Design a protein around this ligand. Structure first.
Ligand SMILES: *[C@@H]1O[C@H](CO)[C@@H](O[C@@H]2O[C@H](CO)[C@@H](O)[C@H](O)[C@H]2NC(C)=O)[C@H](O)[C@H]1NC(C)=O
Ligand SMILES: *[C@@H]1O[C@H](CO)[C@@H](O[C@@H]2O[C@H](CO)[C@@H](O)[C@H](O)[C@H]2NC(C)=O)[C@H](O)[C@H]1NC(C)=O
Ligand SMILES: *[C@@H]1O[C@H](CO)[C@@H](O)[C@H](O)[C@H]1NC(C)=O
Ligand SMILES: *[C@@H]1O[C@H](CO)[C@@H](O)[C@H](O)[C@H]1NC(C)=O
Ligand SMILES: *[C@@H]1O[C@H](CO)[C@@H](O)[C@H](O)[C@H]1NC(C)=O
Ligand SMILES: *[C@@H]1O[C@H](CO)[C@@H](O)[C@H](O)[C@H]1NC(C)=O
Ligand SMILES: *[C@@H]1O[C@H](CO)[C@@H](O)[C@H](O)[C@H]1NC(C)=O
Lengths: 99, 120, 254, 162, 49, 50
């Protein structure tokens, strides 16, 4: 558990991607989660409703994923700014700052 | 690949452009983060061939010439200890160049102290 | 032809532990080195499975409710168990499913059989006694297939009746344990997907007599019932299910 | 790039503009049924399961009852042919981002195209780890990074070099 | 407690798992913040009488 | 009708989780600053102005 901080970031990114692909298998109240099944099984007047349900579900999933990625990117940017500060003040000089 | 789906999706506007722009911003931000952390010197410093540092040993942190990745034993241990429209963009700085940047910083802080961080 | 068997010895049926048995492949999808969660009709781990014996004088052929699905375990030698009977009333009023494997070939029939109260098979020491039904009037489906079949063989079957489709999952295991079920893991491969579309609420297994009155050969079988639950299945590099987790058994597996 | 950035003048840099979604060539229908083709991006129909992907030979030894194959993310990446009892891997049809590397329009109008994660054999052509780069002359000399491509590769104008 | 509502809610997938995971991450982050701020000494020092 | 209630409540819950995460980021930044002040002002004497 020495390198847990990097491993948490890798695991969170992989888990977010995995959940994003798993969201494609959900129909979100439509008859099926596959677009091709809807195009082959229904006429366009009802098919537009079914793809509308799938589009709004997948768009909500993608927006949720992008929002989580933005928050994690902000956290990683803060950590990277801290790491750059440590590189400047601990490696390139001697720091009087305690701890 | 459904053209009817894309025709219906165009009715919702520029959501996809917004999401692509946000992901592109995150992707360039990661490269900016690596650039800010590791590329703090524009000179690639090198250690002398003779490691006479008054009894101080840096072999565990200096790069290993025997290894093809040119990494330190500690860095090699660290790399060993870490294990549908989706694409993964490679980072701008490879692990060899980040290792080279750390090697340059180590050579500067060993041979020159803090002087390389403030000037020549 | 029907014959009452009146030389039985009265004894209550036994109960034992299911351990990690009763697992089957939920679908026809190959998976390699991955963990997959399924909500299907499964048998709970370490459950109370009913134990019936055939020994000499015990001849256990009761008629049991089907419930939502049936796990059948058979610690078998010399092939006493030959088939099963499924239905609702087990007469000509309703329609019943019959599965048999006699000395030659495997027969699957869907007819309105007038079943005996005590149906059985019989081997003379050659098989020359067939007393299963007295009539078969309206037969809607026939299917002839390959042979399915110290206790030496473990025969595990899972029967499900979902959406008018009767799924038979089967597994054969070489065992050498004398009396009870072995403790281990063996995934049941799906054997027969059967298009019947009939109501099934009660079943009865078929045994074989030995004649020299009659003698019951040494056999033992186990009946368990399926409930809707989730299992976490592990698939190795060769695509064979090696381990499973019952999510509702204990908090560790949860 | 001008259409993407909504400007008639483009600054120096790399700009992601579109996607190179390889188009399906043929349609293959297999039932227990036209002929089966391999190593091409086609519209496959295996026993009512439709899609678009390259069908290649597989090293996965399926059990006799199993017909389909899924990865971690529940996407069908393997199939069994119903006519001939063989196993096929479905790799998805080649796709990636299309980025345009240009200097300023004040300087020059020459551009280079980067196809991300796309091999150069199926699309001045140079293969990078980032993808296939068309229109940039690869040189053995090393300079400071002007326009970032990725995987240690950078582009500059001097013609456009990588 | 509506069974039909939960059955319809299962059609939307793992949204609930995502929300619970995010809230759990926030909840452990608060404890980590308190550890980082206050638990910087491993010795409990006491003043003289 | 249940679907309409589910989508409305799910949108509300996702919105609440989103501002909770943003506030969590703000509180984490404040806590990191507080830990820095505890390390540098209490456990040592700081030359940093203000
Ligand atoms: C510096 O330290 C390294 C490792 O700590 C020393 O290398 C060891 O040398 C001894 C004797 O030659 C070997 O038995 C060990 O196996 C070496 N360790 C490794 C990791 O290679 C090295 O001798 C020290 N001194 C100098 C001047 O480099
Ligand atoms: C074996 O025993 C069973 C049970 O006693 C017999 O079933 C009975 O058959 C008579 C027909 O005359 C019915 O009136 C009874 O109601 C049945 N009993 C039950 C419990 O259903 C069966 O007929 C016997 N076998 C033979 C060949 O006589
Ligand atoms: C199984 O059930 C019987 C009664 O049906 C009971 O006596 C026995 O204790 C049960 N066994 C277990 C392990 O619960
Ligand atoms: C199936 O049979 C049982 C008992 O025989 C009965 O209660 C049930 O209603 C039947 N179901 C159908 C669909 O006929
Ligand atoms: C087994 O049952 C089938 C089905 O009626 C029959 O044709 C066959 O003769 C039987 N075998 C023997 C040995 O009686
Ligand atoms: C079932 O059999 C009985 C008697 O053999 C007959 O009267 C009845 O019409 C049959 N029903 C069907 C559906 O075949
Ligand atoms: C998988 O099969 C290979 C042979 O193809 C065998 O060597 C290996 O042990 C098998 N793995 C398991 C877990 O049985």
């Amino acid at each position: 558990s020495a390198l847990g901080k990097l491993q948490d970031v890798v695991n969170q990114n992989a888990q977010a991607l995995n959940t994003l692909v798993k969201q494609l298998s959900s129909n979100f109240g439509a008859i099926s989660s596959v677009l091709n099944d809807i195009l082959s099984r229904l006429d366009p007047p009802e098919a537009e409703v079914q793809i509308d349900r799938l589009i709004t579900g997948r768009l909500q999933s993608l927006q949720t994923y992008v929002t989580q990625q933005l928050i994690r990117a902000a956290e990683i940017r803060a950590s990277a700014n801290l790491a750059a500060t440590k590189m400047s003040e601990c490696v390139l000089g001697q720091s009087k700052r305690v701890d | 690949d459904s053209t009817e789906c894309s025709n219906l999706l165009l009715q919702y506007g520029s959501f996809c452009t917004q999401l692509n722009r946000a992901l592109t911003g995150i992707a360039v931000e990661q490269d900016k983060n690596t650039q800010e952390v590791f590329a703090q010197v524009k000179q690639i410093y090198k250690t002398p061939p003779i490691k006479d540092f008054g009894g101080f040993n840096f072999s565990q942190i200096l790069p290993d010439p025997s290894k093809p990745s040119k990494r330190s034993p500690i860095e090699d241990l660290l790399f060993n200890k870490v294990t549908n429209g989706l694409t993964v963009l490679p980072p701008l700085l490879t692990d060899e160049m980040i290792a080279q940047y750390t090697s340059a910083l180590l050579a500067g802080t060993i041979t020159s102290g803090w002087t390389f961080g403030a000037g020549p | 032809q029907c014959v009452n068997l009146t030389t039985r010895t009265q004894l209550p049926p036994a109960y034992t532990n299911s351990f990690t048995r009763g697992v089957y492949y939920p679908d026809k999808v190959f998976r390699s080195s991955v963990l997959h969660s399924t909500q299907d009709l499964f048998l709970p781990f370490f459950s109370n499975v009913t134990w019936f014996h055939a020994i000499h004088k015990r001849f256990d052929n009761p008629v049991l409710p089907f419930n939502d699905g049936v796990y059948f375990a058979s610690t078998e030698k010399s092939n006493i168990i030959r088939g099963w009977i499924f239905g609702t009333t087990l007469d000509s009023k309703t329609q019943s499913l019959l599965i048999v494997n006699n000395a030659t070939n495997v027969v699957i029939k869907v007819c309105e059989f007038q079943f005996c109260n005590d149906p059985f098979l019989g081997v003379y020491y050659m098989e020359s006694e067939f007393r299963v039904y007295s009539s078969a009037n309206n037969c809607t489906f026939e299917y002839v297939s390959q042979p399915f079949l110290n206790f030496k063989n473990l025969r595990e079957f899972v029967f499900k009746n979902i959406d008018g489709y009767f799924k038979i999952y089967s597994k054969h295991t070489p065992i050498n344990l004398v009396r009870d079920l072995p403790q281990g893991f063996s995934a049941l491969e799906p054997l027969v997907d059967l298009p019947i579309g009939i109501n099934i609420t009660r079943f009865q297994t078929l045994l074989a007599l030995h004649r020299s009155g009659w003698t019951a050969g040494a056999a033992a079988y186990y009946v368990g019932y399926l409930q809707p639950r989730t299992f976490l299945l592990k698939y190795n590099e060769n695509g064979t299910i090696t381990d499973a987790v019952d999510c509702a058994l204990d908090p560790l597996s949860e | 790039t001008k259409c993407t950035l909504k400007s008639f003048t483009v600054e120096k840099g790399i700009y992601q503009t579109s996607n190179f979604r390889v188009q399906p060539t043929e349609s293959i229908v297999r039932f227990p049924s036209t002929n089966l083709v391999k190593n091409k991006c086609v519209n496959f129909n295996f026993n009512g399961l439709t899609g678009t992907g390259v069908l290649t030979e597989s090293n996965k030894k399926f059990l006799p009852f199993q017909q389909f194959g899924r990865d971690i993310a529940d996407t069908t990446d393997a199939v069994r042919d119903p006519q001939t009892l063989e196993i096929l891997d479905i790799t998805p049809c080649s796709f990636g981002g299309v980025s345009v590397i240009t200097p300023g329009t004040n300087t020059s109008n020459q551009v280079a195209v980067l196809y991300q994660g796309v091999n150069c054999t199926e699309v001045n052509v140079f293969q990078t780890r980032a993808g296939c780069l068309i229109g940039a002359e690869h040189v053995n000399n090393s300079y400071e990074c002007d326009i970032p491509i990725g995987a240690g590769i950078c582009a500059s104008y001097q013609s456009i070099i990588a």
